[PDB]
Amino acid sequence: AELNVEIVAVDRNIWSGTAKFLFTRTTVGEIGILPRHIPLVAQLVDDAMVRVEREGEKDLRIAVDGGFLSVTEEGVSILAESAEFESEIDEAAAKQDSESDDPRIAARGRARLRAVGAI
Amino acid sequence: QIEVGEHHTATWLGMTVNTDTVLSTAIAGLIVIALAFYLRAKVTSTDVPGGVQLFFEAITIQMRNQVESAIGMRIAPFVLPLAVTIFVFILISNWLAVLPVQYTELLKSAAADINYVLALALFVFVCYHTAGIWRRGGHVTLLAPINLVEEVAKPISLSLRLFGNIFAGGILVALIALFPPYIMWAPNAIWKAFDLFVGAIQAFIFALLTILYFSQAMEL
Amino acid sequence: MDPTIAAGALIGGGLIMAGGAIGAGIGDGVAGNALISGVARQPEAQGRLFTPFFITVGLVEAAYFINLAFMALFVFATPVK
Amino acid sequence: MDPTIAAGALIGGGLIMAGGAIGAGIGDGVAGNALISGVARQPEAQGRLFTPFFITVGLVEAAYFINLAFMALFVFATPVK
Amino acid sequence: MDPTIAAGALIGGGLIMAGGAIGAGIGDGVAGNALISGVARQPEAQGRLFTPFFITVGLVEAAYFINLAFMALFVFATPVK
Amino acid sequence: MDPTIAAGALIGGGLIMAGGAIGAGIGDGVAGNALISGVARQPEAQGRLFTPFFITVGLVEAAYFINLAFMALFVFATPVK
Amino acid sequence: MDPTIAAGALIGGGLIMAGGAIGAGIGDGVAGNALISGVARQPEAQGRLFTPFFITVGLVEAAYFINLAFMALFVFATPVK
Amino acid sequence: MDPTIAAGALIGGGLIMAGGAIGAGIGDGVAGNALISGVARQPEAQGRLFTPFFITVGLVEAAYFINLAFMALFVFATPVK
Amino acid sequence: MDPTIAAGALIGGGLIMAGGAIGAGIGDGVAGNALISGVARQPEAQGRLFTPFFITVGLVEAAYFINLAFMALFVFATPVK
Amino acid sequence: MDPTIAAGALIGGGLIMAGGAIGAGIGDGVAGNALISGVARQPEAQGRLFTPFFITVGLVEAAYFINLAFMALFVFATPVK
Amino acid sequence: MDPTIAAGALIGGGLIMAGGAIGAGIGDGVAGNALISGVARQPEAQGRLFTPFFITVGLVEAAYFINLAFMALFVFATPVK
Amino acid sequence: SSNFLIPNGTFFVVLAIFLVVLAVIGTFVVPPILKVL
Amino acid sequence: MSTFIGQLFGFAVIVYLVWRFIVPLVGRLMSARQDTVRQQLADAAAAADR
Numbered sequence A: 001a002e003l004n005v006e007i008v009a010v011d012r013n014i015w016s017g018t019a020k021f022l023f024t025r026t027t028v029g030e031i032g033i034l035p036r037h038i039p040l041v042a043q044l045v046d047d048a049m050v051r052v053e054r055e056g057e058k059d060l061r062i063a064v065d066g067g068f069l070s071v072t073e074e075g076v077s078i079l080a081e082s083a084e085f086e087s088e089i090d091e092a093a094a095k096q097d098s099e100s101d102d103p104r105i106a107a108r109g110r111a112r113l114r115a116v117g118a119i
Numbered sequence B: 001q002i003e004v005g006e007h008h009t010a011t012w013l014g015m016t017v018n019t020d021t022v023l024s025t026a027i028a029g030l031i032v033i034a035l036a037f038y039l040r041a042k043v044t045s046t047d048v049p050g051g052v053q054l055f056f057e058a059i060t061i062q063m064r065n066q067v068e069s070a071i072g073m074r075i076a077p078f079v080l081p082l083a084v085t086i087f088v089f090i091l092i093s094n095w096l097a098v099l100p101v102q103y104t105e106l107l108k109s110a111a112a113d114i115n116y117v118l119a120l121a122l123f124v125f126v127c128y129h130t131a132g133i134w135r136r137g138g139h140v141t142l143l144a145p146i147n148l149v150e151e152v153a154k155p156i157s158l159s160l161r162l163f164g165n166i167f168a169g170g171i172l173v174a175l176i177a178l179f180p181p182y183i184m185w186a187p188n189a190i191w192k193a194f195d196l197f198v199g200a201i202q203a204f205i206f207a208l209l210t211i212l213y214f215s216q217a218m219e220l
Numbered sequence C, D, E, F, G, H, I, J, K: 001m002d003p004t005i006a007a008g009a010l011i012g013g014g015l016i017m018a019g020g021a022i023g024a025g026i027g028d029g030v031a032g033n034a035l036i037s038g039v040a041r042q043p044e045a046q047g048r049l050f051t052p053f054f055i056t057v058g059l060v061e062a063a064y065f066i067n068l069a070f071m072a073l074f075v076f077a078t079p080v081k
Numbered sequence L: 001s002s003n004f005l006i007p008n009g010t011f012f013v014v015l016a017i018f019l020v021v022l023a024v025i026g027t028f029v030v031p032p033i034l035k036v037l
Numbered sequence M: 001m002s003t004f005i006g007q008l009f010g011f012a013v014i015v016y017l018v019w020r021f022i023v024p025l026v027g028r029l030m031s032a033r034q035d036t037v038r039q040q041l042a043d044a045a046a047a048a049d050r
Helices: A091-098 A103-116 B023-042 B051-070 B079-098 B114-136 B144-178 B181-218 C002-041 C046-075 D002-041 D046-075 E002-041 E043-075 F002-041 F043-075 G002-041 G043-075 H002-041 H043-075 I002-041 I043-075 J002-041 J046-075 K002-041 K045-075 L010-027 L030-036 M002-049
Strands: A003-009 A013-019 A021-026 A029-033 A040-043 A049-053 A060-065 A068-071 A075-080 A082-085 B009-011 B016-018
Touching: A003 A082, A013 A049, A013 A060, A013 A082, A029 C002, A029 K002, A049 A103, A060 A075, A060 A103, A082 A103, A091 A103, B016 L010, B023 B051, B023 B079, B023 L010, B051 B079, B051 B181, B051 K045, B051 L030, B051 M002, B079 B114, B079 B144, B079 B181, B079 L010, B079 L030, B114 B144, B114 B181, B114 L010, B144 B181, B144 C046, B144 D046, B144 K045, B181 C046, B181 D046, B181 K045, B181 M002, C002 C046, C002 D002, C002 D046, C002 K002, C046 D046, C046 K002, C046 K045, D002 D046, D002 E002, D002 E043, D046 E043, E002 E043, E002 F002, E002 F043, E043 F043, F002 F043, F002 G002, F002 G043, F043 G043, G002 G043, G002 H002, G002 H043, G043 H043, H002 H043, H002 I002, H002 I043, H043 I043, I002 I043, I002 J002, I002 J046, I043 J046, J002 J046, J002 K002, J002 K045, J046 K045, K002 K045, L010 L030
Parallel strands: A003 A075
Antiparallel strands: A003 A013, A021 A029, A021 A049, A040 A068, A049 A060, A060 A082, A068 A075, B009 B016
């Protein structure tokens, strides 16, 4: 089976498709959604990452900022201020961003790192 | 109809020795040295690795990540070999008991003897103790005497946890003996499979608790 | 007499095994509860959760088998005859 | 006498089985609680949760059946006659 | 004597049944707790939750009835007369 | 003697009833806990939750009353006189 | 003798009351836990939660008082004199 | 003899008080757990939560003191002399 | 005889203290669990949570010390000599 | 006789220590569960949570060591010789 | 006689070890439950969570091994011969 | 009879067997494998 | 010999167990883990290639 996934940014639809499994990290702890699942509302951690897993492709890793997450009978919906796919990230820019003193951009950089497979 | 703690015995320098209890121990030791030299004969760096090599590397980096998150690896790398030693040497030492002997059966466990387990546990003790004082030279004041129990606990715990664990099978395989032969094979198989499992898990536990006791001996 | 000691040893061994069984059974139950919940909350976490789980079990069953050993010492090599 | 030892063996075996029953019953209960909760959490996760669940049970019932064995050793092949 | 063995058998059977009752009662309770909670979360999950629930019960009551059997073996076909 | 058997039967019946009481009491408690929690979440779920709840109780009290029966068999129609 | 039976009856009644007390006490505790939690979530749910709560208690205390009755039957109208 | 009955009464009273203590202690504990949790959620709910809490305690301690009474009846006005 | 009564008193007092210890220990544990959880949620709730907590303890330890008193009455001023 | 009293004292002390061990073990377990959970949700909260935790333990182990003391009074300075 | 004291010592040691086993087993279980849950969502926490966890275990197993010591004192260096 | 949970000289024996075996893969396995890693 | 014929009547079912289920599984897995390092050394060859 498969579950419908939709990631919407504040001013754009980041992604929309179907998936086999969906891993992310709520403020309360990491979590993995599967095609059927309890209705749920949660808030992703500040430097969260979203790994979508699809049947015939390679898994799609996304960095998310200020995200919220909700699972319903129709599928998963992730609400983000901003999102950045894995094949769009400068790991060195994200690295120097990670060592900032500003918590917000530090979390942005940590998420961009998590997406690229570092940290 | 059966009585536990019976193995042949003798003496060597006034100390009493088990005439049993040492043959299967040496079988385990020579097996580990064997597969180790077999590794060395079929080791590689840029090939496809042999089954022995993949087995041992899985074990090795498992223990390695355990150590490194428990302690800074550089701080005490010497525990990594000591860990692997403990694992395989105990693993086989229980799995050696899989083979069927009884007519009285003396190919069975080395851990069914209190002294073998006592030696392993108290060696682990001397090592992490000297490591603790090598590093440094309770959480509440009046809680302190409990702490005294704590480190007298660990070698005891490590010792009897293993003995009783294998001794269990060391008894059960005997009991089931007097169960009728035309039926005994099925519970025999069931218990033997579960004993394989428990031996594996128990070697795992002894190794992991070894590492963690090293750690809490060596942190700061 | 002698049989009185034998009976005392049998009852004592029984108590030791009963305590061991209660402890091990409930301890493994309460540990597996967390294991299943973790695997239900995150599946790819299974291979991870098998490290703390079996640590816990290694402790729990330990107390069990120690008792088992002493039960033998009570029943077969009774200390006082 | 001899019957005194027999009675001690019967009481000891009883205690061993009682401890086993308490341990196994509550352990399987506390494990199945997590199993059912996971199933409700994710229906498909069932085929996945049957791996840790039965591991837990394999431990719990283990302590039970070990006791069972020793109970036999207490009642039938009583160590001291 | 002989009655001493009979009394030992009665007490042992009593202990076995008491352990069985505690184990089964609390195990079924702790399993039904999860069942009811799941059915309170998702009503149409009921037909699903009856698979893990009855699995758990199948284990719990198992330990019970095994004890029951052995209790009979203690009381009626007492091993040592 | 004969009174020794009678006393053994009384103690055994006592143990059986005690185990039954512990099992039933705690099992019904742990089931009613889930029932009340469900009714605190969704009031109009009450008429629904009475199906799994009473199923659970039907199991729990079962183990109780079975013991009760056997207690009678221990006390009134004592197997060995 | 006769006093031996009397003592057996006293011990059996004691066991029955002890089991009853453990069962009732913990069962009412685990039920009131859910009651208080529900009333802490929704105050105006109190008048509602008193329906399932007292149902649960009606079961729990039941097992208690049944035991109480039988305890009397053990102590006053002892079955075998 | 007579002292045998006296000893049986003392042991029975002991068992009754032990069961009472376990039941009351754990029941009050499991009730106060919910009370404290409710007061940690909503401070001004305290004056409210004291209604269900003390109801629960009124039940729990009840089973205790009943046992206490019967313990006296076992120890002082022993039914059979 | 007289020593038989003395031994019965010692065993009864032992049972009373054991029940008291189990009850008090677990009750205080289950209460402190809620206390710590509340203080982990809201630090400045500590000074508040010490009101319900110590109420609960005041109940739990009560059942303990009552038993303690009666244990003395069993051991020193034994009712029947 | 005198040895009968000695045996009663040994059994009573055993019961007292067993109750103490159960109470302390489970109480510290249920308290450390909350401690670890608080540290898991909030690690920095550790230095804070060590205040309520050790309070709880101070209560739990208290009941233990009190029993320990009385066990000595049962075993060494037996009240009735 | 002397064997009566020996039997009392064996039964007392048995009780002490049984209490120890129940306490340690369930305490380690309830602690490992929290450990696994913390590692479930926060696998990284495992390294940190190993500080409070082993503290808890250090307490729990403490009560166990203390009992173990005293059990030896009951069995080998029996206080009263 | 045999209070078989009191130690025996056999202890020292396997300590030897353990010691050398440790020393064995102190050279023969894991320094090679850690370098292979 | 009864006890030996019985214990290895059990041994037969044990290694029938292992040859039907487990070592095929670890064959799958160790084949995969050999394939991975094989592919990565092939990738190193392709990298020096490039």
